[PDB]
Amino acid sequence: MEQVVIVDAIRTPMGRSKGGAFRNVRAEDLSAHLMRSLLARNPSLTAATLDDIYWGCVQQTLEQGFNIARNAALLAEIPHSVPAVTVNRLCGSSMQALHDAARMIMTGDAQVCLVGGVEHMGHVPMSHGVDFHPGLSRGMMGLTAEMLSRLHGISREMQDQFAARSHARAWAATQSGAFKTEIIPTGGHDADGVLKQFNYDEVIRPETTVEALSTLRPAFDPVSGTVTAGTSSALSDGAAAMLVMSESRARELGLKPRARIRSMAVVGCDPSIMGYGPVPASKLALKKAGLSASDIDVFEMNEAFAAQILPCIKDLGLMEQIDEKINLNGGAIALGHPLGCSGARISTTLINLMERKDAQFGLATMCIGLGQGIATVFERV
Amino acid sequence: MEQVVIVDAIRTPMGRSKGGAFRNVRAEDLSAHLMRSLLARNPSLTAATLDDIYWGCVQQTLEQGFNIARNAALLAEIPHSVPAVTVNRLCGSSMQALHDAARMIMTGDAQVCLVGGVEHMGHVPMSHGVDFHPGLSGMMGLTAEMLSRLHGISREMQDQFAARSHARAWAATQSGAFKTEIIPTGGHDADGVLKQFNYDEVIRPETTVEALSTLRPAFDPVSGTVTAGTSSALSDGAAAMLVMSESRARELGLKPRARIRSMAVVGCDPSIMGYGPVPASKLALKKAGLSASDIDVFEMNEAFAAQILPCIKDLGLMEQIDEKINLNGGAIALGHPLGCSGARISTTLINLMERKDAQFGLATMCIGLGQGIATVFERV
Ligand SMILES: [Ca+2]
Ligand SMILES: [Ca+2]
Numbered sequence: 001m002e003q004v005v006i007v008d009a010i011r012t013p014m015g016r017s018k019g020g021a022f023r024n025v026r027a028e029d030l031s032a033h034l035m036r037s038l039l040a041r042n043p044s045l046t047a048a049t050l051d052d053i054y055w056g057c058v059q060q061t062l063e064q065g066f067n068i069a070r071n072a073a074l075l076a077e078i079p080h081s082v083p084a085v086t087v088n089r090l091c092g093s094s095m096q097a098l099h100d101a102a103r104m105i106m107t108g109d110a111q112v113c114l115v116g117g118v119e120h121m122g123h124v125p126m127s128h129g130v131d132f133h134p135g136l137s138r139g140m141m142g143l144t145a146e147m148l149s150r151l152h153g154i155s156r157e158m159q160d161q162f163a164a165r166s167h168a169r170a171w172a173a174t175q176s177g178a179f180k181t182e183i184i185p186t187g188g189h190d191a192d193g194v195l196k197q198f199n200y201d202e203v204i205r206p207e208t209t210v211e212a213l214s215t216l217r218p219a220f221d222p223v224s225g226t227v228t229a230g231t232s233s234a235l236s237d238g239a240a241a242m243l244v245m246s247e248s249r250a251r252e253l254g255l256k257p258r259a260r261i262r263s264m265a266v267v268g269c270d271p272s273i274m275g276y277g278p279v280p281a282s283k284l285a286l287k288k289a290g291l292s293a294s295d296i297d298v299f300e301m302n303e304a305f306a307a308q309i310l311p312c313i314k315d316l317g318l319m320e321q322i323d324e325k326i327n328l329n330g331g332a333i334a335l336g337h338p339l340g341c342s343g344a345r346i347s348t349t350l351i352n353l354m355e356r357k358d359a360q361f362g363l364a365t366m367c368i369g370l371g372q373g374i375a376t377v378f379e380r381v
Numbered sequence: 382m383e384q385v386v387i388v389d390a391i392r393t394p395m396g397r398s399k400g401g402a403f404r405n406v407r408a409e410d411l412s413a414h415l416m417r418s419l420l421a422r423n424p425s426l427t428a429a430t431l432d433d434i435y436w437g438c439v440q441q442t443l444e445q446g447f448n449i450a451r452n453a454a455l456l457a458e459i460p461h462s463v464p465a466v467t468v469n470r471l472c473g474s475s476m477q478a479l480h481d482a483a484r485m486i487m488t489g490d491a492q493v494c495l496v497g498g499v500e501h502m503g504h505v506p507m508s509h510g511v512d513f514h515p516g517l518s519g520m521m522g523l524t525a526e527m528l529s530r531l532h533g534i535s536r537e538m539q540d541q542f543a544a545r546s547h548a549r550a551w552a553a554t555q556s557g558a559f560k561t562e563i564i565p566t567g568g569h570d571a572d573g574v575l576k577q578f579n580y581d582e583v584i585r586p587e588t589t590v591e592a593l594s595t596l597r598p599a600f601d602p603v604s605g606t607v608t609a610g611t612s613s614a615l616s617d618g619a620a621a622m623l624v625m626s627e628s629r630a631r632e633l634g635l636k637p638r639a640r641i642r643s644m645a646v647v648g649c650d651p652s653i654m655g656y657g658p659v660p661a662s663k664l665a666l667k668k669a670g671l672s673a674s675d676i677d678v679f680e681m682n683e684a685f686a687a688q689i690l691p692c693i694k695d696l697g698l699m700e701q702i703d704e705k706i707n708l709n710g711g712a713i714a715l716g717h718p719l720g721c722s723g724a725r726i727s728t729t730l731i732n733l734m735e736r737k738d739a740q741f742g743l744a745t746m747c748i749g750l751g752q753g754i755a756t757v758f759e760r761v
């Protein structure tokens with residue numbers, strides 16, 4: 001079986017969904033922009049040699065409906081002979097896209113694929129078109145969302161410190177140019193309604209402090225709740241993308257792999273213990289890779305809530321490694337959690353950090369709504 | 382890499398979307414019904430050993446939103462530990478579910494998966510929540526009818542093929558040919574009384590070429606040839622398959638009913654609607670090391686008679702239509718519930734392969750906005 005290498009990995013800026021950069025830019029255009037860009041940045045790839053396009057997106061209606069992967073590819077002027085499919089495993093959708101594309105390559109059904117995802121939460125909000133089956137109805141929000149923080153004694157103060165850290169790290173990455181290698185300037189509109197090329201994550205708040213976060217009211221129970229809006233993922237609009245191929249094809253084309261997929265895992269877990277997914281998903285991915293958590297040099301763990309990611313970090317035995325290894329350029333608290341895009345976004349952030357840290361192994365993992373988890377171990381070379 | 386075998390393949394009846402069987406049954410319930418059924422029918426499979434569930438569905442909002450694969454699996458009381466994902470390649474979605482699950486097994490990331498799909502077109506119609514990018518392109522007569530104009534497929538030829546679809550589907554209904562694949566499914570009869578349906582309510586046995594000849598063109602009034610009567614029906618339904626490595630099947634003492642020989646997906650020109658099955662099938666056959674003549678049974682999704690006839694012609698199969706193609710009818714009679722159709726035609730194909738003692742079958746379909754998907758199955 002062929003091994004699967006990532007040859008390029010890019011993303012849009014994360015726009016503020018509530019009135020920000022991409023309020024007048026459609027999901028298919030954010031997507032098409034990255035698809036076009038992946039091709040443009042890699043001249044040795046002839047576009048018609050793409051074998052498939054896998055794209056994550058959750059709220060598949062309105063501008064995200066009717067197979068956005070294909071709509072975006074047509075808008076990007078990728079040859080119509082290249083097929084395209086849209087994948088939905090909620091939060092993990094574009095990491096799923098990576099997995100299915102990689103397996104298409106491993107089996108020889110493909111040699112090159114585009115992978116990525118998008119979520120335009122400003123245009124197709126999570127609350128839009130909801131009709132949950134009565135049979136899944138399952139105070140209950142706090143009960144479930146804070147189960148892990150109650151279990152692991154993760155206080156409001158620890159959550160606020162982690163959230164302040166997310167913005168501080170994302171801002172330091174912005175200021176130092178550390179995100180320049182992954183962000184493709186993308187057109188949006190500034191506060192005055194004027195066309196603007198964005199080359200930074202609008203959604204990061206450099207004014208964030210632990211003091212200010214400490215003023216906020218609990219999102220759930222007013223008396224015992226610890227989660228706040230300030231320690232939950234931001235609401236952003238964005239896309240992320242990767243060019244993946246067999247190691248053979250990369251060699252033929254004379255492209256240096258940026259990373260290789262070492263293992264992939266996806267798991268179910270109890271939906272009522274929200275956010276636990278990364279633990280069994282990461283353990284399974286590590287087992288499949290022949291590695292332990294200690295072998296991993298850089299982790300990207302999606303920050304849906306500080307109240308959930310901290311327990312996961314604690315359970316994987318990583319609490320003392322947070323500042324050396326985990327979400328080193330911040331995470332979804334600062335950058336947002338545009339569902340469809342997040343899997344490829346954290347994989348893109350991870351690979352760039354691996355390069356800068358000269359890391360041998362990286363792990364990207366995330367929780368998934370209604371009790372799932374997904375993880376990928378990446379290896380450099 | 383492991384060979385991937387299909388141990389079971391089942392579907393609901395196709396309910397009439399306009400006020401028929403499943404008007405009060407949710408998409409997640411049609412899906413969960415089939416998941417439960419696969420488990421009941423294969424008792425040596427322990428549900429906690431499922432490695433994933435891939436489910437096709439296109440209109441993923443309302444009751445089909447928020448990853449219906451998972452929601453249906455939880456409703457079916459499949460253990461929480463089993464993951465689930467919903468896939469969307471329009472018309473080809475549940476065939477895509479098959480391919481991705483197959484490859485998960487081939488690479489050893491899985492040993493057993495559920496595959497299937499659903500589309501409840503009554504509850505989430507194709508016209509709901511549409512916002513098509515202004516910069517982009519089955520409507521518009523020019524594109525829908527291009528193949529029929531290139532190949533000289535007349536109104537009369539289209540009406541003939543459509544009447545044949547209902548006739549073959551009704552014959553299958555009467556002969557018991559669908560008994561093995563249809564799981565009786567709760568719906569409501571015309572008076573609102575609970576009823577277990579075990580037949581495809583949407584088929585119209587009274588269809589005649591004479592009646593079809595009366596209909597108006599769907600597109601241009603003057604020169605249009607396609608009609609609603611020669612386009613796929615609107616039905617609600619689900620289909621599902623239990624797929625596993627040949628090794629795991631042996632361990633569980635479950636008999637393989639077919640195995641995957643090859644898989645293909647291709648893009649094609651979106652302005653030449655319905656052509657996908659041609660390059661998809663040619664690619665699948667090439668990868669299989671087979672020719673079209675090796676295939677004993679073909680399932681070619683009937684989006685429009687005007688498009689499937691040219692596809693048949695370009696694959697060199699015009700003389701084999703009654704011998705090999707859509708032998709129990711197709712989407713003109715049975716409907717085209719997008720998410721479900723890939724697994725549905727695969728299910729119908731595998732059961733026909735058994736009834737005909739075939740070695741090779743090919744199932745293929747066009748996909749909106751210019752794609753094609755195909756699978757070659759083998760029965761050893
Ligand atoms: Ca480069
Ligand atoms: Ca080391």
Ligand SMILES: [Cl-]
Pocket residue numbers: 389390391561562563732
């Ligand atoms: Cl069956």
Ligand SMILES: [Cl-]
Pocket residue numbers: 386637638639640759760761
């Ligand atoms: Cl077989």
Ligand code: NA
Pocket residue numbers: 260261262379
């Ligand atoms: Na490796």
